[model samples]
Target: GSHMVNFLKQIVEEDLRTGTVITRFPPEPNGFLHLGHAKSVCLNFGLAKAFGGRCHLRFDDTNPMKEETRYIESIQRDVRWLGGDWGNHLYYASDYFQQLYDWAELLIKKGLAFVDDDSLEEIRRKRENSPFRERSIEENLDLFRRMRAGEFEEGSRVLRAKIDMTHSNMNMRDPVLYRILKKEHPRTGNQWVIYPMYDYAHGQSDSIENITHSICLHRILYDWFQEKLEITRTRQIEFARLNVTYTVMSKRKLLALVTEKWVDGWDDPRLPTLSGLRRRGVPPSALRDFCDKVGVARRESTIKVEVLEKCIRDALHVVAHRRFAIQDPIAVTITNYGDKVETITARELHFSKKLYIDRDDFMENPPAGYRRLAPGAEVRLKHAYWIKCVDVVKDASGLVTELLCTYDPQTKNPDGRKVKGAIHWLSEKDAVPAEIRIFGRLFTKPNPWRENINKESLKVYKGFVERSAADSAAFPPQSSLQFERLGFFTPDGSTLTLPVFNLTVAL
Candidate 1:
């Protein structure tokens, strides 16, 4: 058998050979782009480009109360950044408002749509409980025409599709197509007192643009999309909504997290938003690769965050130049040697002139299986000569202040010699001053979506790294690299000129 192909790609390829379509990606501008949206963006844009057709970047700005110019701008930037080009085909649903209104009037004339003056709750209860009692189409039409002429208060009357009120499927039951909202639109700006609902606008907008395929995430509204397309000549295709584990994809929930001060902002490193992930120093390339790996599927599957981290690790492993920085410092001093500072290096060094060792490698009372520096113990100093720890110094707090070791030059590997444990270090002369950020997972729990647990009630923990590794390179904020023994780090960009590092991931 041939290598299996993804369902959507296979369909698109078949359509291409048959000359059936030129695709389109319709995004509703209501919130920031999440990882799930990335999947659809890549699939739709990728298929369009692959098939030598076009994908239009259209904003389904049906709800002016929730949609904004900020969201529109963000989505456009995200799609473009994800390697999709719409060129000049950036269109808005509001651009066809008059056309949509005309169509609604036609539906009203055909007795397909009508206006209901009852409150939303009353209509909802009637539709839910009775599903059999209502006014006539003529009565509904007068109310709808009056609504169009501003004869009623906002939300007092709405134009609804006069479908079966008792249908088993809830969406098919006399769904509202247009609602009176006197609020100003971001683009139209108070010109329209009544705005089209997504169900009413989406299909007609696709029809207006002559879009062959109306592609979007397979959400709860997919059924409504099917119903709307039945009113027009467009084909509706459903792709699975992207879901990543350890994140709540609901924008409402995420906004609550920010408004309640549970998170720093929408772009908090913990967030799965594109801006948040990018700010966390997750390379755009890595995100693209992750999307590619996940591929196009119309199934419900939640992938672990480790899958993304694995992609990052696999991408950076071969490229990142190793460096070292120790976060916590403990000193060991040798008594046999006077106050002399000696430098050591790794022979097959991870870097050319530098090496780093964890500060915790030394111990006063040596434990079994421990091979590092201890009292009277001989430990090879990486590429440098062997050193014997003769003494240790302590501060007033009784912490090991420094290490005093006597170096044996004969043990140095000028020609060829084998050492037990080799460490890394930087030459004092060539060392660059850097602030290292060693980051951990943003959330303490594996699942951040769980509630009722007091996150603040949990104790905080501090991790330690060696001293030599801590004081190496001064990196710009949001800058990313892999530490020799430690994991990956990115600059936080909070401090200007003074390098502040945030740990991005473990290697």
Candidate 2:
């Protein structure tokens, strides 16, 4: 068996010595999945695959307040897209609600649990000791049963575990195990009037499913429930959560962005959500490789966004075909040519008498070391003959709109001619108009949640793509192509307009 050096791998190897190494990716279906969740998914699912064991996709859907069926469906889709095969091991915490309820009763019978009638604020103020803490076991049981029977209004009472309130860990201070919520659950649909709290449900659900390793990003619950339930089979481990620079990973913040119309939607290309990245043409394999490269550690750190961009670039370099596109185009007419319209073919490109070059490729006043187009300066059109700008065409406003250029038929190769500058262009007659969307980092700072961030992260432009590129066979929505000298781009399948492309990344 191959050995790995990461901490999680080492722990898994140790667990395999005793029995089957079962792990799980438990997520609450409250919002769309993001890159941070991707890291957790890869780690849990990857470990199971490597050890020849099974990983369960379990929904920790305890809170009906934020959970939704759409989020649940989206979570499963994203997990499958990342190659996480849970097989028959799919589960939901609600499925184990009965068992969790039975366990809570056991604690109540043992005098380790009680029913509190305090308001939420009062309970928080008296975490050490709710005035109802001294209630008799019979009274606690009766009130808990009524709490379940819908005899009491929501928030009228709650079941709390009897633990040391003064313990150094605040989580151990008489935490509530169950709360009365009249809200209907996505799966249960008002079948019950009360719901078990997450801390009370998470551990028992794992125990019921026979999960051996409960790897979580939060450190609050490690071994707390294990000792409370006195269950020794399931072991809890905590690791640092993944955070990338220039992005906020909080679901609440992401939800605000969507609800406030700060973005197009959850899958906006500029957002860090997994759906957004996928729509942006990021490959699942690249995400897996990125997670592996990030490795597992206990300490938290902010990873540079460039590390992720490099991974994407590395993956795209192999599959993206090169093409030409012109954003901010300027017309160019080849003067002194034959009367007949001529077409020149080079590799996959065909050039004609009229072409469009990038507006930035020309300068009225030449600067030192500038090698691109200017009056009396010659530059090679990529993969075609050389051209010299002889005159400029302008409108009444004096803005240079077009260039009158002469092509040198002998300079096709420009062999030993020292043509230092080569620029990409599209034949004006053969190019198709396209709308290009360029995206920048959504946040202006490394930690946007803590700072005022840039809201205008996306910029839209009108451009043109080579006819061959536009006429190519329809590709999958996520397929990408490199717009030579511009950047990587993909047909924006999400848009209804003709010939719309999303700039996947800058060169």
Candidate 3:
């Protein structure tokens, strides 16, 4: 229950005592929901459930050009998958268009709002200028009426609140209440050309739904909460945004990455989008655990990507079945034994053999500390008998093409022979057909854009998977597996049908 109650729950609890129990999650349908949005979703919906009330899934679909039905659907899926309930309270700001318009008229009649002909740039200049001349109540009333009568073109007129432009807070300076964007809304289509701005629509929608508590990320808490409080009486609480390394959460930065082709698209696995993470083979349960581990905080902080990866790794470790794969292959041979090929089955999964060993076991002259196959040295072939390498067959190009190793029937494990160094193996025939992708950190260096630690030097080269794993299907969309002596990997989604396997990262 402690895990179920987020900080917003305390706010809801206080309001519950006063008999105010409704709540709402207002997400702008601009981009796919990320882990940051997941936090807010948990808080809003979690609070409603705790109080036996309802939470509304409100698409702050006020920005028609940027908002889409696709994003709305994604938000809904992410929320529901995280165990939140919105029930039939799913609504959109556009749905209350008529009511919003009526309220705007009321504001105009009371001389509290007006229509201004200033360009967006000019309005910004006035607000940022020393002597701000905001439109008065009278100036607002007449202009708003004409603007509503379709007397001006798009961007030529905007409904401006008659707030004190001289106020120290930048948002209080006669913010644009409504704008004329001739774009089609996904919900309302092209029915209306004029649309309410976010600040104008958000609080009003919450008020209309009688939300007792409005939860949001800290970055927007000050502006959004103040906007709501200015227009209507409501309580607002903020939670820290989910911060992860190698990820810039700014939508502008993310859009730039897409535009510059730094990433394939919005759902690129490298992206922080929920769908992107899912396509990367990150389980929803792992994601929820990750968010929960980051927990709720009032202050902003950056979380290491390893921490998130480890959370996923921890969750998947218990359920993931182990398999062996090799990335590079070499050959060994037995000079004394006659040429005879023998096949052996490795581990079985409930009567069906499933696992295999990597092919990197044999080496002609292994290093001093190497315990694997070498001339005259013996090792156990997993699930089979002891084998000794006697020779290697090399092609004209000086590459070892095949192995000529011999197995000892006396050392066979049928009667439990005492074999010292046993290694896994999969029969070439019984191996499951699959594709495994191995990914590393996106940025070669820990800090992607940081200055080089060494000016004129190569980056460190470390370990890699075995060669036998390469026999898997070249391209797979969702296939995932573990490489023996290496990490877990999943196939990339982009080149799903191709033979080239690009991995997301090891789990």
TM-score leader: 2
Flag regions of model 3 displaced more than 4 Å. Answer: 1-15, 18-20, 109-111, 128-138, 217-232, 327-389, 401-424, 432-434, 445-484, 490-507
Give the TM-score of each candidate.
0.80, 0.93, 0.76
lDDT of candidate 3 over 21-114, digit per residue (tens)? 6678788888777767776777787778877888889888876745476777778876776677887757888888877777777776665667
Residue-pair clashes per candidate: 26, 0, 17
lDDT of all predictions: 0.64, 0.80, 0.62
What are the C-alpha RMSDs, in order, of all predicted structures?
5.1, 2.9, 6.2
Arrange candidates, best TM-score first. Answer: 2, 1, 3
What would the per-residue lDDT of candidate 1 be over residues 416-502, giving only the tens digit for each residue? Answer: 443455443333333334555444444555455345323542121232233333443534445555655556766564210434445
Encode model 2's per-residue lDDT on 1-507: one tens digit a residue. 385557776776667776667789998888788898899998889878888888999888876745467777898889999999897656888887777777788788878899988899998887658888888888888888888889989888899988788875667788889998888887877777888887788877888888887777443453666665667558777778898888887877887777777788878888888889888888888899888878888898778888888888888888987778888889999886645545665525665678899998999889978989998898988777889999998999999999999988764565555777988888866688888788888888876534366756787879888776776474556787888888888777641165777777778
For residue 32, model 1's alpha carbon misses the true position, in angstroms, by 2.1
